[PDB]
Amino acid sequence: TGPRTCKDLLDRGHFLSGWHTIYLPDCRPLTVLCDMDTDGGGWTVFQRRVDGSVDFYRDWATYKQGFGSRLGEFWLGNDNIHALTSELRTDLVDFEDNYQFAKYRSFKVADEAEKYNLVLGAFVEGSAGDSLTFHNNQSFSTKDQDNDCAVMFQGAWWYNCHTSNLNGRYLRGINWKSGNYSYKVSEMKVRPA
Amino acid sequence: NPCLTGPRTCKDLLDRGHFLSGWHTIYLPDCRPLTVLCDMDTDGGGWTVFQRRVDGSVDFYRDWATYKQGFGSRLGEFWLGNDNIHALTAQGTSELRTDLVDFEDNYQFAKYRSFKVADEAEKYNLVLGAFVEGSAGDSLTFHNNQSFSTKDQDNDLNTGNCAVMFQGAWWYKNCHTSNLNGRYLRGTHGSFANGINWKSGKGYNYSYKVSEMKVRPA
Amino acid sequence: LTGPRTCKDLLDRGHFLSGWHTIYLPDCRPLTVLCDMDTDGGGWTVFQRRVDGSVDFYRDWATYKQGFGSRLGEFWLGNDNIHALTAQGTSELRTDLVDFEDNYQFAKYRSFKVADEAEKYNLVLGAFVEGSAGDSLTFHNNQSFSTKDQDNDLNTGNCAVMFQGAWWYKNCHTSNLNGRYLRGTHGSFANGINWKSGKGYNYSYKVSEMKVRPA
Ligand SMILES: *[C@@H]1O[C@H](CO)[C@@H](O[C@@H]2O[C@H](CO)[C@@H](O[C@@H]3O[C@H](CO)[C@@H](O)[C@H](O)[C@@H]3O)[C@H](O)[C@H]2NC(C)=O)[C@H](O)[C@H]1NC(C)=O
Ligand SMILES: *[C@@H]1O[C@H](CO)[C@@H](O)[C@H](O)[C@H]1NC(C)=O
Ligand SMILES: [Ca+2]
Ligand SMILES: [Ca+2]
Ligand SMILES: [Ca+2]
């Protein structure tokens, strides 16, 4: 029928990163941020931090539906991420402009009934080093839902409790252990396996 | 056919499950499409943003015709246009919100119960309801029932030219206690009250990093 | 749709804010482009934008051909698109430049056309009309586009490599707007976002934009 993914869009000749609408297997439309530039492109970005203008210390309902701005920082929403999911790439930039990434061969979040349980594939490569497998098979947790954190390190993650905290505070935190240091830029993105 | 099925406000859009802030098209009461910036994130969301300053990349020291039609960029700073702002507030009760950020990352705000600008014939007269609350303090009530003025069309209550003296465009009285369309002066300035100023907020000598004005139906 | 064919059409239809809109190319191919509705009367289609150095412009032929970058920031629209945009009739060109002290310079030319890929996206430029940046494009008239992997210049070496850009290089250049984002004055010779008649071979601008409008 029409574009299912950012990869479809890239194959149809959309070469600039930006917000495009795609159709989920639901057939429900959704405008997403396509990264057409990184690692071959065709990535759908579901998380972005870039300047600390958006509060990421949010409750369950807010993470469920998504929040933020197409103009800047956002979380796409756990329902959308579930519908969406296919491999994972996390991109990270520090304040010295150093680039660091990690790539997982598969990435899926379950539905709300399974509390958006993270089921993550094998680490593939990445100067950032593996820091999410250790959170595999864990529900998602927000300040208004325990799960052995969210309040301790101020954020929301598949928390006993973490080795990455990308929805943490913009401290200039947004931590990746293998990578006390909060990154300038963080992006989480997906692409058909 | 799209007018009758399309959304009429950002609140409608939020109601249809649009949770990310961004530019969407809505249909004015006369059925004309208008691409607006929806703030879905702040104070429950569903706000239509008609003003935004963020980096000083756009000149806001503009004439009447330019303020009338709107100017700026969807990528950054803009004024939606006085005709559009009138169309959006002409019928019913839109509350107004003002969000301000300083260069030390202090977020401040002001909220009013209703906000309407009249049409061009009435020179976009401001009809402002009650100040509800806001950490930024009230700096708009002073401007109720004032015409809008630009450097080239002085409709203020000052014997001189407010828009020229304070280098902006606004519902100036004699002259102002707020000046959000003022120069992008970046924090403190020696020049007097000619920046993005909110008197009850950071005063007449400090120009905000971020300014946003937005409406939502009551 | 038979609708808007240019950013100027959009402006006439009452689109007053700069931003990305879709237009219909001469062949009815739809294209989403950045419209500058603010500058010099507005109605400009922007095909090049530098603003913060977040995008690598040191790219190969295929990449310049199809376009690259981001609607959120820096981009090159793509040589095929630029050709499609400028084949029929008269597009005038405006080049807008902003230094790190926020001073604006510009250059305006009466006509601007790039040929198709067979003709190596040749520069066909009209008379300089005015501009505070001076004229650093006319030197480049009637010259094939070159990238690091496709050397069509008049130098015995590879201009694109020597000045880390992609341009209508001769021997080698007087402007280099797709050069490295070097942030102001730089010791290194002429490998930044340079406009000789502007801030010279040793100053790289903060902002650069190249745009077209029906004359
Ligand atoms: C907005 O401001 C306009 C000025 O442009 C106000 O118009 C003025 O309204 C006052 C009411 O407070 C009128 O004063 C009254 O004058 C009559 C004589 O006509 C007198 O009997 C009363 O004792 C009282 O002083 C005044 O005429 C009028 N002036 C003009 C030039 O129209 C208007 O009231 C304001 N509107 C709102 C909603 O505040
Ligand atoms: C352009 O240059 C080509 C060779 O590169 C030459 O054949 C032709 O005469 C030139 N045309 C014009 C109009 O300058
Ligand atoms: Ca006056
Ligand atoms: Ca080659
Ligand atoms: Ca050569």
Q: How does DSSP assign chain B, residue by residue?
A: -HHHHS-SSHHHHHHTT--SBEEEEEE-TT--EEEEEEE-SSTTS-EEEEEEESSS-S-----HHHHHH-EEBTTS-EE--HHHHHHHHSSS-EEEEEEEE-TT--EEEEEES-EEE--GGGTT-EEE--EEE-TT---SGGGTTPPPBBTTB--SSSSS-HHHHTTS-B--SSS-SB-TTSB---EE-SSSS-BS-BTTTTBTTEE-SEEEEEEEE-
Distance CA C5, CA C17 (A): 17
Sign of the four-CA dihedral A47, A51, A54, A56:
positive
Distance CA C69, CA C72 (A): 9
Give the residue among B169, B177, B183 at the shortest CA–CA distance from B203: B177
Entry field: residues in chain A: 193
CA distances from B90 to B82, B116, B132 (A): 12, 6, 21
Strand bridging mode B107-112 / B131-133: antiparallel
Q: Is B74 within 8 Å of C17 when comparing Cβ atoms?
A: yes
Sign of the four-CA dihedral A148, A152, A153, A156:
positive
Distance CA A92, CA C208 (A): 27
Q: How was this structure determined?
A: X-ray
CA distances from B112 to B133, B141, B172, C75 (A): 7, 9, 18, 41
Q: Taking a C-beta distance cutoff of 8 angstroms, is the pair C125, C135 a contact?
A: no
Up-side HSE of residue B50: CA atoms within 13 Å toward CB? 27
Q: Which chain B residues are within 8 Å of C15, Cβ to Cβ?
A: 35
**CATH numbers and ranges of domains, chain A:** 1-128+185-193 (3.90.215.10), 129-184 (4.10.530.10)
Distance CA A7, CA B169 (A): 46
DSSP state of A94: -
Reading the block at residue B96, the tokens are 């107004």
Indicate which of C54, C63, C71 best probes the interface with A, i.e. most A CBs within 10 Å of its own CB: C71
Residue whose pair of structure tokens reads 């970005």 in the numeric block: A45
Distance CA A151, CA B191 (A): 44
Task: Give the bridge partners for B47, in sequence order.
Answer: B39
Helices (H), chain A: 6-11, 60-65, 78-84
CA distances from A93 to A114, A175, A181, C155 (A): 32, 11, 11, 38
Strand bridging mode C30-36 / C19-24: antiparallel
Distance CA B185, CA B162 (A): 18
In our burial notation (b when 16+ CB lie closer than 10 A, e otherwise), range A120-143 reads bbebeebebebbbeebeebebbbb
Q: Taking a C-beta distance cutoff of 8 angstroms, is the pair B78, B55 a contact?
A: no
Q: Taking a C-beta distance cutoff of 8 angstroms, is the pair B55, C51 a contact?
A: no
Q: Is B81 within 8 Å of C16 when comparing Cβ atoms?
A: yes
Entry field: residues in chain C: 215
Distance CA A177, CA A129 (A): 9
In our burial notation (b when 16+ CB lie closer than 10 A, e otherwise), range B65-95 reads ebbbbbbbbbbbbbbbbbbbbbbbbeeeebb
The residues, ordered by sequence, that sit 6+ positions from B196 with a Cβ below 8 Å of its Cβ are B53, B179, B180, B181, B182, B183, B184, B185, B207, B208, B211
Report which bound ligand comes closest to the CA of C170.
Answer: 5
The vertex-A183 CA angle with A182 and A185, nearest 5°, equals 145
Residue whose pair of structure tokens reads 């976009």 in the numeric block: B124
Task: Give the bridge partners for A143, in sequence order.
Answer: none
Distance CA C5, CA C23 (A): 5
Distance CA A85, CA C165 (A): 39
Q: Taking a C-beta distance cutoff of 8 angstroms, is the pair A182, A168 a contact?
A: yes
Distance CA B183, CA C134 (A): 29
φ/ψ (deg, to 5) at C119: -95, 15
Which amino acid, one-letter code, is at C167?
W
Which amino acid, one-letter code, is at B209?
K
The residues, ordered by sequence, that sit 6+ positions from A40 with a Cβ below 8 Å of its Cβ are none
Count Cβ atoms below 10 Å from residue B204 Cβ, excluding itself.
17
Reading the block at residue A126, the tokens are 């990445």
Q: Is C19 within 8 Å of B73 when comparing Cβ atoms?
A: yes
Strands (E), chain C: 19-24, 30-36, 44-50, 68-69, 75-76, 91-98, 104-109, 112-114, 123-125, 128-130, 184-185, 203-204, 207-214
Distance of CA B211 to the CA centre of its chain: 9
Distance CA B71, CA B27 (A): 20
Sign of the four-CA dihedral A124, C56, B72, C33:
negative
Q: Taking a C-beta distance cutoff of 8 angstroms, is the pair B217, B92 a contact?
A: yes
Cα-only R_g, chain A: 16
Residue whose pair of structure tokens reads 């300047």 in the numeric block: A51
Distance CA A137, CA A159 (A): 10
Distance CA B206, CA B193 (A): 8
SS3 category, C138: helix
Distance CA B24, CA B2 (A): 14
Reading the block at residue B136, the tokens are 């930024």
Task: Give the bridge partners for A189, in sequence order.
Answer: A45, A89
Query: How close does chain A come to C70, measured CA to CA in Å?
Result: 4
CA C113 to centroid of ligand 2, rounded, Å: 15
Distance of CA B43 to the CA centre of its chain: 17
Nearest Cα residue in chain C from A15: C68
Give the residue among B81, B168, B59, B72 at the shortest CA–CA distance from C42: B72
Distance CA B169, CA B70 (A): 13
Query: If 0-12 CB within 10 Å is exposed, 13-18 middle and 19+ buried, where does residue B217 land?
Result: middle
Q: Taking a C-beta distance cutoff of 8 angstroms, is the pair A176, A128 a contact?
A: yes
SS3 category, C150: strand
Distance of CA A192 to the CA centre of its chain: 15
Residue whose pair of structure tokens reads 């239809």 in the numeric block: C13
Give the residue among A90, A77, A102, A89 at the shortest CA–CA distance from A24: A77
Longest dimension (CA), chain C: 52
Which chains contact B through at least 3 pairs of Cβ atoms less than 8 Å apart? A, C
Residues of C with CB under 8 A from a CB of A: 20, 55, 66-72, 75, 78
